[PDB]
Amino acid sequence: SRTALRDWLTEQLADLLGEPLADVRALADDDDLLGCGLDSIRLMYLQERLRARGSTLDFAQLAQRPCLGAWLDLLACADRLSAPATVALPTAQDRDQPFELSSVQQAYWLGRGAGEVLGNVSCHAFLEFRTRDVDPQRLAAAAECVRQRHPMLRARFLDGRQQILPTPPLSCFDLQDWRTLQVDEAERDWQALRDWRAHECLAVERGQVFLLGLVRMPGGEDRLWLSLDLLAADVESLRLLLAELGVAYLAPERLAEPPALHFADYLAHRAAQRAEAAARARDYWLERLPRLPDAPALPLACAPESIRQPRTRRLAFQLSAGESRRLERLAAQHGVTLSSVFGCAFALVLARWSESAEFLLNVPLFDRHADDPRIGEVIADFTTLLLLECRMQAGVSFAEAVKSFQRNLHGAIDHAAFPALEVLREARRQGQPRSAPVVFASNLGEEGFVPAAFRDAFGDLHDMLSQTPQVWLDHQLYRVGDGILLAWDSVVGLFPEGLPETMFEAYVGLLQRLCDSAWGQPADLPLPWAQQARRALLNGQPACATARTLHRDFFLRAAEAPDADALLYRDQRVTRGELAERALRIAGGLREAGVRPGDAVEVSLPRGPQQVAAVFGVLAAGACYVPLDIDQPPARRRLIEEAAGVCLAITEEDDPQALPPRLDVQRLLRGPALAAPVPLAPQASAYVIYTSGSTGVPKGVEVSHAAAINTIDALLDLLRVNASDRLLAVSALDFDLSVFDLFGGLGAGASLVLPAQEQARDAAAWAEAIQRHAVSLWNSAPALLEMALSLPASQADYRSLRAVLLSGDWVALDLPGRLRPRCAEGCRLHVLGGATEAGIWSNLQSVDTVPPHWRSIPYGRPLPGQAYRVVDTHGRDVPDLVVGELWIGGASLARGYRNDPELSARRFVHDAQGRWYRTGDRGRYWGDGTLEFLGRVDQQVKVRGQRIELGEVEAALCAQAGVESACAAVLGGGVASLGAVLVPRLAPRAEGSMDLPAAQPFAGLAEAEAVLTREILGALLEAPLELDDGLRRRWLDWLADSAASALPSLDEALRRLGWQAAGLTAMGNALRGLLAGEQAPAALLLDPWLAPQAVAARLPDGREALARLLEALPTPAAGERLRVAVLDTRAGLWLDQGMASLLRPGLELTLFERSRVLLDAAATRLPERIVVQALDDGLLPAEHLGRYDRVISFAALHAYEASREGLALAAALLRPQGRLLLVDLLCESPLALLGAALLDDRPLRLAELPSLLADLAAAGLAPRCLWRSERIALVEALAPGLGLDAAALQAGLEQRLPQAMRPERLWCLPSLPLNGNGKVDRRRLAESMTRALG
Ligand SMILES: Nc1ncnc2c1ncn2[C@@H]1O[C@H](COP(=O)(O)O)[C@@H](O)[C@H]1O
Ligand SMILES: [Mg+2]
């Protein structure tokens, strides 16, 4: 009855809150009980009382609607609709026996071992307290009294089990009386004792789970301190050890009763009583296990595997009684537990310090749930560990975040019934390596953490430590005073030195603005202000530029000294006057050709003075130059000419009827000179560099003169570039480092040494050109300079080279090591950062030397006038050392992409901090404000210094007629090659019209294989212990079901199948060799008596199928070449049964496999004139696509994960109108079924013939089923015009990609592998291609 139930709940709440019964009855039905000071510890008690009343509700059901009315309306359902909690408990377990560990004690125990991830430590709490005088004889009594009073305080831990001893062999109390000492010595010795015993691994293996102790300081001070391994205790149990030590010190007679409910009795009861909720929670965790977030991805100075004996460092902050009150009142007004305030505020900090906002944290629940009320006096480890996934919402108030985090935590509390350790174990077994190495422990009992009976004897908690193993950062909370001690037991040296302090200072700041300001304020933290202060300096670097047309300065340097050498090229030179005139003639020719201000002009000239004159001439016509290599291939050039909206192209070719009108630079050099460059305002489009672009369409990066010249000035004024300098422009014109050579170098009036197009990658030409023109300035991607430095110092003298710019790709840490002894005195290497989209660069790390902690040469300070943010995936700045997305900002940015406003809005984003490029580079601001770049998260990679989007390479391969989809990756090995992988499209058909005469087989052959199974198993089942239990259970039954029952025959079977007693003897012995040699399972495929294809090739009349599959190969009678391939080679063992008439005169035959080792076992025995080709790590080298007039599959199509795998592979491998020849098991071969059992791989793979045909016709091949039917069916099928070939791909790549990004090696898969998100597995494919490089 509902009113009687509200009375019962009122009485439970009046107990659990301690409020009066009448006052609690006066709470309204919708009045929030967390809004009255209910918390989770009380609510699990109330929920346990409801469970004990048979009124079964989950904690989450009560907790998602935490008010009396909602509880009553849940309960009016549950008292008739919900399951009874009735379980037959074990009423006792034998009290001295080595009983099982609780799940969280198993975690601590396994974490105690030296080998485990961040292991080798206790899990102990250490507590320190102060007082003037206390008696050691009271304390030595008190410690041994509490060891005898509570079973768990003397529990030995061995071998994954715990044993309550009679009395432990080792003392409970460490008296350290030092009233003898000098204070300074005792205080340092205290620090030595503190450091030892607060990190000490307690001797739990000898039942010392806890050790009290007391230093007596010569300053007249007793530092009572307490080491307790939480293997023995909940921190709630620890504060009861404190209460009892308090009474046992003060008045030991008042210790009421040794609390009777022994911990083995509790674990037996609790495990059985949780068991259905644990199985229900297990279903929930299994459905989430591939979807768990990881560890909080915090900035680690060391890998957690690599610090061998982790000291905890405590950080702590006593929130005042007033701060606590303000959190408690706001928490109540916002309907949340005080633990959810702290857990949410901590998860916001962890989110803000993580590379991802989704992570686990290990939340130790209280789990004191047993029927005897004295369980709340027992001292065992009643913790149970909740693996809280939390998934912190960015861009919300804290009120929204804490309610979300509470509903998440409260929702997860029932799912803690399956313990966090078994979740993580099941993750490790499922190949999900995950851990929850950040702990969160709310210990908020209002009596105080240190209980009254102990505070009356000793000072309130002076200090403490955790030592939780596997755990980086143990965040406890305690009531201390009636305030709240926040503690972060971070691990020493795991994090960067400033970080846990800085992160905790931001956590305290967060909790204080939660005391002191309403929760409608953002959950998204400020940075720790000092981090934002540093970064606002480094971003705030002043413009350091005069906003002007980009060409202005060169035309000034020309007007100021017309005779000075502007360009040096192929051992001739061009003056600034000559170049300015040549440019202004081009400009006049361009205005004559209808080009006009901020309209755009392609420049596509071989590297040399006419190119430089043309870009200056475009700019001096007022136009935006759109550089492309002359090597840029015609279809790609048409994508760019189309996308750029380009007015004109300059190309040495005259063609006024091209896509843009295309012009001879030599004719534009006949043009009248403009008397000046056209006046452009600084913001006009200056260069549009066509970077590679991920949809396949290349992308024009439209950079204003202001933007370009802000980078250039910021760097000219740093290099101190002057008229005596000369630059080697190894920069290609469509790679925007050239824009600095071009308008920086000549704007300062330094000369440009240009390589010829003949010298575009030629280190020896650069070395000659540098030593010949005494080049002072280098500028490149470091791939080009490492190439230049690979010439010896005797062959390539760079001592003229005053200063060096390295850019746009990873500088190796030893490149300044190679470079400083090679280049000039005053070497001035600068490594520069930032993308095409940001003007020519955006950072500068100078490198006089590399300090050893650089893992890469960082992006330095931002260049003057431009800036970096590093952001979370929600746009807010990440804290220092945290990885986030590099946003380049400020005056240097490109205006956008030339005609892609939507991709521009995706990249050039606007924020309260101005305009930002959102690069997709990852990186982190170090504590010194330097910006370590950390590579890229996305499909964009660097090939020979140049930028490539793998999405472009893939799209340029999908642009092949015949490709369904593609993958690309830059590969491992010293070659650093770009690879790619193809799925062909199959041109499907439906082809059920089939005309196989089925009649050749007879049932006596399946009976004969049954008799041979009776021979082989009848012998090996004299020694069935050679097998495993799966082989035994199958083969003992199959000795009827596949060998004799309903399959009678004589040993004439063997004479019908064709193998005789020497064969059977080798089958039995080779199988014993497979079993007992430890080579399982793969050695099945290395022996002609073992393998499913080798047995099939004679036993099921696979030889009479082979007599037809060995035919359709006309080459010797044709007098002419036939190209043939085999998919199902394995160790070659079926070809060995056709070999002489298989290996026909005139033939090309190629072996393929899907492993190396089996094909190499084929090459070890088959004649080496046959061509050998791995499909290494699944992967077909594309040099074989469309090559073969005949393709073979043989007694292994079942072994492909679909027929559609092998059939698409065959269809790709076949030349058009060439033929597949396919034989496979459809019916059981009883002996191939032994082999299937030894692979332990399903004989359900053996197709029906209609299904084989439907899959094959879906793979587009037109079939005829020929012969040999249900034992082994020979199908041929004939290839459509799939249109792929090696040379056709190479030609289509040569049409659509420059030689920078055509894959130097190319492959195919019948489908791409998916990672666990359902996206293409570019890491597995990068590895697979790397393995396929050999
Ligand atoms: N010093 C560098 N080290 C490594 N990568 C760099 C460096 N400088 C620039 N990059 C990055 O390389 C990426 C590819 O080059 P980009 O074509 O300009 O986009 C960009 O996102 C750049 O920020
Ligand atoms: Mg770029």
Token couple for 1184: 């074989």
Scan for tokens 């910021």, then name that residue: 714
**DSSP labels, 407-438:** HHHHHHHGGGGS-HHHHHHHHHHTT------E
CB of 946 closer than 6 angstroms to any ligand 1 atom: no
The 3-class SS string of 996-1008 reads: CCCCCCCHHHHHH
Instruction: Work out which ligand 1 atom sits closest to the CA atom of 859.
Output: 1
For residues 479, 480, 484, 489, the Cα torsion angle rounded to the nearest 10 degrees is -100
Is the CB of residue 815 less than 8 Å from the CB of residue 782? yes
CB of 1034 closer than 6 angstroms to any ligand 1 atom: no
Query: What stretches of 349-482 adopt beta strand conformation (E)?
Result: 358-366, 383-391, 438-443, 463-465, 473-480
Backbone angles phi, psi at 1006, to 5 degrees: -70, -40
CA of 808 to the centre of ligand 1 (A): 4
Tell me the torsion sign for CA atoms 837, 841, 844, 847: positive
373: how many CB neighbours lie within 10 A of its CB? 8
CB of 807 closer than 6 angstroms to any ligand 1 atom: yes
167: how many CB neighbours lie within 10 A of its CB? 10
What is the three-class DSSP state of 1307?
Answer: strand
DSSP letter (8 states) at residue 492:
T
DSSP letter (8 states) at residue 826:
S
Report the phi/psi class of residue 962: left, alpha or beta, with left for phi > 0 and alpha for psi in -120 to 50. left
Please state, in angstroms and rounded to a whole number, the distance separating the CA atoms of residues 704 and 898. 11
Closest CA to 32 of 68, 2, 83, 64: 68
Query: What are the CA-CA distances from residue 52 to residues 11, 17, 49, 56 (Å)?
Result: 15, 19, 5, 8
Token couple for 409: 């935590």
Closest CA to 705 of 909, 893, 901, 918: 893
CA of 693 to the centre of ligand 2 (A): 9
117: how many CB neighbours lie within 10 A of its CB? 16
For helices 338-353 and 321-333, give the axis angle rounded to 10 degrees: 100
Please state, in angstroms and rounded to a whole number, the distance separating the CA atoms of residues 40 and 340. 9
3-state helix, strand, coil in the chain (%, to 5): 40, 20, 40
Mention every residue, 6+ apart, whose C-beta is less than 8 A from residue 1081. Answer: 1074, 1238, 1239, 1240
Please state, in angstroms and rounded to a whole number, the distance separating the CA atoms of residues 700 and 1170. 50
CA of 835 to the centre of ligand 1 (A): 5
Mention every residue, 6+ apart, whose C-beta is less than 8 A from residue 1248. Answer: 1226
Closest CA to 879 of 299, 486, 297: 299
Closest CA to 550 of 804, 840, 812: 840
For a pocket test of ligand 1, which of 931, 942, 1301 has the largest count of ligand atoms closer than 8 A to its C-beta?
Answer: 942
For a pocket test of ligand 1, which of 715, 897, 933 has the largest count of ligand atoms closer than 8 A to its C-beta?
Answer: 933
Is the CB of residue 711 less than 8 Å from the CB of residue 763? no
CB of 1224 closer than 6 angstroms to any ligand 1 atom: no
CB of 208 closer than 6 angstroms to any ligand 1 atom: no
Please state, in angstroms and rounded to a whole number, the distance separating the CA atoms of residues 1127 and 1196. 9
For the stretch 435-472, what's the b/e string if a residue is b when 16 or more beta carbons lie within 10 angstroms of its beta carbon? Answer: bbbbbbbbbbbeebbbbebbbebbbbbbbbbbbbbbbb
CA of 1320 to the centre of ligand 2 (A): 24
Mention every residue, 6+ apart, whose C-beta is less than 8 A from residue 553. Answer: 743, 746, 747, 748, 749
Instruction: Using a CB cutoff of 5 Å, list residues around ligand 2, an ion.
Output: 691, 835-836, 947
Query: What are the CA-CA distances from residue 275 to residues 105, 418, 630, 974 (Å)?
Result: 18, 9, 73, 56
Task: Return the ligand number nearest the Cα of 843.
Answer: 1
Please state, in angstroms and rounded to a whole number, the distance separating the CA atoms of residues 239 and 243. 6
Closest CA to 689 of 903, 898, 917: 898
Residue 1220 CA, distance from chain mean position: 41
Report the phi/psi class of residue 2: left, alpha or beta, with left for phi > 0 and alpha for psi in -120 to 50. alpha
What is the three-class DSSP state of 994?
Answer: coil
Element (H, E) at 1139: helix 1139-1142
Mention every residue, 6+ apart, whose C-beta is less than 8 A from residue 952. Answer: 692, 693, 694, 695, 696, 698, 1297, 1301
CB of 739 closer than 6 angstroms to any ligand 1 atom: no
Mention every residue, 6+ apart, whose C-beta is less than 8 A from residue 419. Answer: 103, 104, 278, 384, 385
Residue 368 CA, distance from chain mean position: 39
CA of 947 to the centre of ligand 2 (A): 6
CB of 691 closer than 6 angstroms to any ligand 1 atom: yes
CB of 835 closer than 6 angstroms to any ligand 1 atom: yes
CA of 1223 to the centre of ligand 1 (A): 53
1248: how many CB neighbours lie within 10 A of its CB? 12
Backbone angles phi, psi at 971, to 5 degrees: -100, 160
**DSSP labels, 305-330:** TS-SS--EEEEEEEE-HHHHHHHHHH
Burial of 667 (C-beta count, 10 Å sphere; 0-12/13-18/19+)? middle
Is the CB of residue 632 less than 8 Å from the CB of residue 1295? no
**Hey, which residues does 319 pair with through a beta bridge?**
484
Query: 259: number of CA atoms within 13 Å, CB side?
Result: 23
Query: 694: number of CA atoms within 13 Å, CB side?
Result: 6
Backbone angles phi, psi at 412, to 5 degrees: -85, -20
**Strands 221-229, 662-663: parallel, antiparallel or unpaired by DSSP?**
unpaired
Cα-based angle 86, 89, 90 (whole degrees, multiple of 5): 165
For helices 576-592 and 609-620, give the axis angle rounded to 10 degrees: 60
Residue 423 CA, distance from chain mean position: 20
Mention every residue, 6+ apart, whose C-beta is less than 8 A from residue 940. Answer: 692, 694, 920, 947, 948, 949, 950
- Amino acid residing at 894: A
Mention every residue, 6+ apart, whose C-beta is less than 8 A from residue 798. Answer: 767, 770, 771, 775, 778, 788, 822, 823, 824
**Hey, which residues does 476 pair with through a beta bridge?**
441, 487
Please state, in angstroms and rounded to a whole number, the distance separating the CA atoms of residues 1278 and 1266. 13
- Amino acid residing at 370: A
Closest CA to 152 of 28, 46, 261, 68: 261
Instruction: Work out which ligand 1 atom sits closest to the CA atom of 920.
Output: 21
**Strands 699-704, 685-691: parallel, antiparallel or unpaired by DSSP?**
antiparallel
Backbone angles phi, psi at 338, to 5 degrees: -60, -35
Token couple for 1129: 């080679």
Please state, in angstroms and rounded to a whole number, the distance separating the CA atoms of residues 231 and 468. 10
CB of 128 closer than 6 angstroms to any ligand 1 atom: no
What is the three-class DSSP state of 469?
Answer: coil
CA of 623 to the centre of ligand 1 (A): 27
Please state, in angstroms and rounded to a whole number, the distance separating the CA atoms of residues 420 and 1. 38
Token couple for 1211: 């269809």
**Hey, which residues does 268 pair with through a beta bridge?**
none
Is the CB of residue 738 less than 8 Å from the CB of residue 625? no
Closest CA to 537 of 94, 163, 921, 861: 861
Please state, in angstroms and rounded to a whole number, the distance separating the CA atoms of residues 155 and 378. 13
CB of 45 closer than 6 angstroms to any ligand 1 atom: no
What is the three-class DSSP state of 1211?
Answer: helix
CB of 698 closer than 6 angstroms to any ligand 1 atom: no
**Strands 1171-1172, 1147-1151: parallel, antiparallel or unpaired by DSSP?**
parallel
CB of 952 closer than 6 angstroms to any ligand 1 atom: no
Please state, in angstroms and rounded to a whole number, the distance separating the CA atoms of residues 550 and 689. 15
CA of 836 to the centre of ligand 2 (A): 4
The 3-class SS string of 919-988 reads: CCEEEEECCCCCEEEEEECCCEEEECCEEEEHHHHHHHHHCCCCEEEEEEEECCCCCCCEEEEEEECCCC
**Hey, which residues does 804 pair with through a beta bridge?**
778, 829
Please state, in angstroms and rounded to a whole number, the distance separating the CA atoms of residues 56 and 69. 17
Is the CB of residue 462 less than 8 Å from the CB of residue 365? no
CA of 919 to the centre of ligand 2 (A): 9
CB of 833 closer than 6 angstroms to any ligand 1 atom: yes
**Hey, which residues does 726 pair with through a beta bridge?**
751
Scan for tokens 């999908």, then name that residue: 958
Is the CB of residue 682 less than 8 Å from the CB of residue 622? no
Is the CB of residue 1235 less than 8 Å from the CB of residue 1090? yes
CB of 736 closer than 6 angstroms to any ligand 1 atom: no
Token couple for 366: 């209280």
What is the maximum span of the chain, computed from C-alpha positions, in angstroms?
114
Strands of the 1122-1126 sheet, one edge to the other: 1171-1172, 1147-1151, 1122-1126, 1188-1194, 1214-1225, 1272-1278, 1262-1267
What is the three-class DSSP state of 337?
Answer: coil
- Amino acid residing at 315: L
Scan for tokens 């991920």, then name that residue: 694
Q: 1081 preceded by cis ω (within 30°)? A: yes
Please state, in angstroms and rounded to a whole number, the distance separating the CA atoms of residues 339 and 270. 24
Residue 1113 CA, distance from chain mean position: 49
CA of 897 to the centre of ligand 1 (A): 17
Scan for tokens 């005080």, then name that residue: 338
Backbone angles phi, psi at 161, to 5 degrees: -145, 160
Mention every residue, 6+ apart, whose C-beta is less than 8 A from residue 1. Answer: none
Alpha helices in 122-262 (DSSP H): 136-149, 183-199, 235-250
Is the CB of residue 495 less than 8 Å from the CB of residue 504? no
Please state, in angstroms and rounded to a whole number, the distance separating the CA atoms of residues 254 and 433. 51
Backbone angles phi, psi at 471, to 5 degrees: -120, 120
CB of 933 closer than 6 angstroms to any ligand 1 atom: yes
Cα-based angle 650, 654, 656 (whole degrees, multiple of 5): 95
Is the CB of residue 420 less than 8 Å from the CB of residue 436? yes
Is the CB of residue 863 less than 8 Å from the CB of residue 832? yes
Burial of 565 (C-beta count, 10 Å sphere; 0-12/13-18/19+)? buried
Please state, in angstroms and rounded to a whole number, the distance separating the CA atoms of residues 417 and 276. 9
Tell me the torsion sign for CA atoms 456, 461, 464, 469: positive
Instruction: Work out which ligand 1 atom sits closest to the CA atom of 921.
Output: 21
Q: 1230 preceded by cis ω (within 30°)? A: no
Closest CA to 677 of 610, 581, 602, 584: 584
Q: Atom 5 (ligand 1): residue with closest C-alpha? A: 809
1251: how many CB neighbours lie within 10 A of its CB? 11
Q: Atom 10 (ligand 1): residue with closest C-alpha? A: 808
Whole-angstrom distance between the N-terminal and C-terminal Cα of the chain?
Answer: 77
Long-range Cβ contact pairs of 68-72 (< 8 A, separation 24 or more): 68/6, 68/9, 68/10, 68/27, 68/28, 68/29, 68/31, 68/33, 69/28, 69/29, 69/30, 70/29, 70/30, 71/9, 72/2, 72/5, 72/6, 72/9, 72/29
Is the CB of residue 567 less than 8 Å from the CB of residue 751? yes
